[PDB]
Amino acid sequence: TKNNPVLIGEPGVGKTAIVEGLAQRIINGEVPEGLKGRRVLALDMGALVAGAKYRGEFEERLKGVLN
Amino acid sequence: LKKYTIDLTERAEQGKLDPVIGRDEEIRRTIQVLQRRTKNNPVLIGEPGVGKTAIVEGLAQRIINGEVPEGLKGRRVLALDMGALVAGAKYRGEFEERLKGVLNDLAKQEGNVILFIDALHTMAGNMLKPALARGELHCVGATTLDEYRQYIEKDAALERRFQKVFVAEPSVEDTIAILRGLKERYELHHHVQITDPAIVAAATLSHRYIADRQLPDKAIDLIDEAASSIRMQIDSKPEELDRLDRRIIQLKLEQQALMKESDEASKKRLDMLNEELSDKERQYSELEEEWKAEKASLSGTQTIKAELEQAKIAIEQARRVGDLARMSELQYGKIPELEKQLEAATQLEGKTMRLLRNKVTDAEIAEVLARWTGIPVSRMMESEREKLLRMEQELHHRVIGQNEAVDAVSNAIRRSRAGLADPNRPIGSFLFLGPTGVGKTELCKALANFMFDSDEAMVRIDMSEFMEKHSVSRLVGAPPGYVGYEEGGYLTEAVRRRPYSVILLDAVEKAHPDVFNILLQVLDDGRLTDGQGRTVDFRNTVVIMTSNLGVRETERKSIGLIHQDNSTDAMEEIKKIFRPEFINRIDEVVVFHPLGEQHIASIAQIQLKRLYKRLEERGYEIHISDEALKLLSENGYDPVYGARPLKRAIQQQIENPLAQQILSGELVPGKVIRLEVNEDRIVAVQ
Amino acid sequence: SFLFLGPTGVGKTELCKALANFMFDSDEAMVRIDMSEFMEKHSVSRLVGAPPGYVGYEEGGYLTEAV
Ligand SMILES: Nc1ncnc2c1ncn2[C@@H]1O[C@H](COP(=O)(O)OP(=O)(O)OP(O)(O)=S)[C@@H](O)[C@H]1O
Ligand SMILES: Nc1ncnc2c1ncn2[C@@H]1O[C@H](COP(=O)(O)OP(=O)(O)OP(O)(O)=S)[C@@H](O)[C@H]1O
Ligand SMILES: Nc1ncnc2c1ncn2[C@@H]1O[C@H](COP(=O)(O)OP(=O)(O)OP(O)(O)=S)[C@@H](O)[C@H]1O
Ligand SMILES: Nc1ncnc2c1ncn2[C@@H]1O[C@H](COP(=O)(O)OP(=O)(O)OP(O)(O)=S)[C@@H](O)[C@H]1O
C-alpha cells in the first residue's frame, strides 16, 4: 500500500523525463523482476473533459475506465 | 439491485480483510448507537489514517465471528457506491429513482442491513432528511473534522440526525500491538522476516521525527517500504553476480573484438584473455549456482508459509462448520510437521544464506527514514568516518584559526550524529561575538559546503531587514483574510520542505524584540506555528547567529575587555530583551580574536588559488617571488581592520596592471607570468 | 486561572508539562500559544479567526477550534 509516489521539485529538473528514462529501462528489460512486461500508460485530462454538459456523464466515463 | 449492492460481510468472510487490534470502547460506543431507535446513526470523527474504515471492517469481522450481541446477529452491512449512483443519470430524476429504489429495498429489507456510507460530503439528501428524521434507515457515517466543519455544520437537519465518534489517535505501544497483528500479512505478501526491534524502533522513530502524518499508518507504510525493498534486493541480481557480470561482459565484448583478428598471428596472441575468460566463467558460474540454490531455498520456505496460511484458512472455516475432524486434524495434523520442517528449513537457511539477506531489521528502517528526511543511523560510520575524523582539518582548509569555534561546532555535530541530543531541542544554537576579521559567515559556508556540499542550501536571513513591526509578517507569513495569507513566510516554508538544515542569522542587533521572542519559541522546544495554522519542527536544525555586539565595542575597547565583561556590555543591548531563557537557551557564546600575520599569509595564498582558476580559464600562470608576496603581507595588515585589506590590496595593487596588459593584447596565452618587482610596486611579467 | 511570575530555570514549562503529563498522560495534549507573537492588531484574527467573506473565516483560529 501507498503504491503511488510523488515527484516534487522545480520544473525542468526532469520529473517527466525521470518517468521517461524509467520506461526506457523497462523496455530495455533492465528493470527488476515482476515488472518485466508490465506496462506504463499516461492518462491526461482533455479526452476526459469532453461533452459532459449533463450530470453523470463524465463520472460514468471515469467509472468505466476504472473498471 | 446488485449494481449498488456491496457487502463487506462476504469480504471479511472470504478473508480479504485485515485484523483490527485492541479497539473496544469505540466499537462499544458504535453498538450503543446501533441499538438506538432515533438519531441512531453514527459518524466517525478522526484524522486521516487513524483507521476509520478499518474500524468498520473489523466490526464486520466481529460480526462474522458471531462475537457481536444477539441484536446484531443475522444483520448485514453494505457500504455505498456513490460512483455507481452518479453513473448513468441521463436526465432529471433517474438518480432519485435509483435512490428511492434503494430506499425501498431498505424498507422491505426491514432493519436487517445497517448501512455504511463513507465520504459523507458526497451525499440528494433532500429525500433523506425525512427518513433520517423518523429513523426509518440505519446508516453509518465516516468523515473528517474539516468536512465536519465545511459540510455538516451548515445543515441543521443533519446534526439532529447524527452522532460524533471521537476516533482518537492511538498511542505508541498500542500501535506496536497493531503491528504485531499485521506482521503476518506483510511477512506473507512480502516474503521475508521481520524482527521486533524493527517494530519498536519503527514506532519510536516514526512517532518522533515524522510530524506530518499520524499513527499507525506512517509506521505501517514504513514496514511496507522496507519489506518491499529487501524483497527487491533478493529478487534483483546480487552484487558479486552483477560486478562479475560487468567484468565478464567487458571480457565478452573485449573477446568479441579480440577473436575478430586483423592479423591472426598477432591479434590471436589473446590466450591470456581467454584463460581469464574461463577463470571468470568458473567464478561467475559458481556464485551463479549458489545464488540459484539460495533462491530455491527461499522458494521452499515461501511454499511452507503459504500452506501454513492454507491451514489457517481451513481452521477458520473449521470454526464455521464446527467439523470436529478438521479442528482436531489441524490442531493435531499438518502444522506440527510444518513446524518441524519449517524450523529445519530456517536452520538450513542458517547455513546456506550467505549471499542474500531476508530478515529486515533496524538499519533498513534507518535507511528508509533517511530516504524521506535525510538522517540515517548505521550508514554514517563507513563513509562518514573519514570526514568526521578530519572535520577540523576540513574546516582548516577554508577557515584558519579560531580553533575554539571549530571544536565547538564539531562537538555539536558529533552530539548530533552520535545520538546525544535532547529530542525536544534543536541541535545547535550558536552566537558569534567579539571582533571580526575572521570570516564568520565564511565559516558558515564552510559548513554549507561541508555537509550539504554547497553554499546554496544554507538559508540566510538578515536581521537588519527586520527592525519593523511588519517584519514578522515578512518572515513567518500573514494573518488570515489579508494580503499575503495563502503564501506563508518562507522560513517555515523552507524548513517544512527540507526539515533538517542549517539556518543562518546575521547581525542580530538590528532586529525586533518579537523576532527575538518568536526566536525564543525557536530555541525553546524547537517548534513554531505560522499564521496559516500549523506548527513546524526545528529539532534537528542548527541556527547560527553572526553578530557584532562585540565588534561594536571590542575593537574599540581592545584593552581590558574580558569574556565576562564582553558578556556585560553585550548584556547592555542584550539584557533587556534577551533573558536567561534566551541567554541560557543559546548553546555556546563563541568569542573571536584578531589575526596572526602568518594567518594573513595563509589567506593570501588561499586567494591566489581562485585567481589561478581564472588563469586556467584563459591558459596562464602566475609565479611570485617570496618577497613580493611579503610585500602583500606588509601591505595587507591593519590591526583594527584585521587581515581584511588583503584581497583588495592584492587586486588593487596587481590586477589593475594585469588587466591593462591583458586587455592590450600584450600578454600571450600559453605562457608563464612571474610577479617580478621592478620597483616596490609589483609588476606582472611574461 | 494562574499567573506565574519569577526567575529563570524554575520549571514553569516543566510545571505545565508536569500537569499535562499528570492528567492527560502526555505533553502533546497541552495547547501551546505564544503571546509574544501577538503585538499587532491582527493577532485576534489569528487566534480567533477572520471576519466573514475571507479565508480564515472558513478555517477559524487556533483556540476556537481547539477547545
Ligand atoms: N536528467 C535529465 N536527462 C535528460 N533530459 C533531462 C534531464 N532533466 C531534465 N531534462 C529535460 O528537461 C525537460 C523537462 O523536465 P521534465 O522531465 O518535464 O520534468 P519537470 O521538472 O517536471 O519539468 P516540467 O514537466 O515542466 S514540471 C525534459 O523533458 C528533458 O528534455
Ligand atoms: N488498528 C488498526 N488495525 C489495522 N489497520 C489499521 C488500524 N488503524 C489503522 N489501520 C489502517 O489505517 C488505514 C487508513 O485508515 P482508514 O481505515 O482508511 O480510515 P482513515 O483513518 O480515515 O484513513 P483514510 O482512509 O485516509 S480517510 C486503513 O487502511 C487500515 O489498514
Ligand atoms: N580569517 C579568515 N579566513 C578566511 N576567510 C576570511 C577570513 N576573514 C575574512 N575572510 C573572507 O572575508 C569574506 C567575508 O567574510 P564573512 O564571513 O562575511 O565575515 P563575517 O564576519 O561573516 O562578516 P559579516 O557577514 O559582515 S557578519 C569572505 O570572502 C571570507 O573568505
Ligand atoms: N525545577 C525544575 N525541574 C526540572 N527541570 C527544570 C526545573 N527548572 C528548570 N528546569 C529546566 O529549565 C527549562 C526552563 O524551565 P521552564 O520550565 O521553561 O520554566 P522557566 O525557567 O521559567 O522558563 P520559561 O517557562 O520560558 S519562563 C526546563 O525546560 C527544564 O529543562
From Swiss-Prot, chain C:
Location in the cell: Cytoplasm
Effect the entry attributes to changing residue 12 to T: No effect on ability to form oligomers. Loss of chaperone activity
Annotated residues for binding of ATP 2: 6-13
Disulfide bonds: none
Induction per the UniProt record: By heat shock and other environmental stresses.
Entry-annotated residues carrying N6-acetyllysine: 41
Family: Belongs to the ClpA/ClpB family.
Extra facts: One peptide binds per ClpB hexamer; the binding site is formed only upon ATP-driven oligomerization.
Task of the protein: Part of a stress-induced multi-chaperone system, it is involved in the recovery of the cell from heat-induced damage, in cooperation with DnaK, DnaJ and GrpE. Acts before DnaK, in the processing of protein aggregates. Protein binding stimulates the ATPase activity; ATP hydrolysis unfolds the denatured protein aggregates, which probably helps expose new hydrophobic binding sites on the surface of ClpB-bound aggregates, contributing to the solubilization and refolding of denatured protein aggregates by DnaK.
Domain notes: The Clp repeat (R) domain probably functions as a substrate-discriminating domain, recruiting aggregated proteins to the ClpB hexamer and/or stabilizing bound proteins. The NBD2 domain is responsible for oligomerization, whereas the NBD1 domain stabilizes the hexamer probably in an ATP-dependent manner. The movement of the coiled-coil domain is essential for ClpB ability to rescue proteins from an aggregated state, probably by pulling apart large aggregated proteins, which are bound between the coiled-coils motifs of adjacent ClpB subunits in the functional hexamer.
Quaternary assembly: Homohexamer. The oligomerization is ATP-dependent.
Protein name: Chaperone protein ClpB
Organism: Escherichia coli (strain K12)
Lineage of origin: Bacteria, Pseudomonadati, Pseudomonadota, Gammaproteobacteria, Enterobacterales
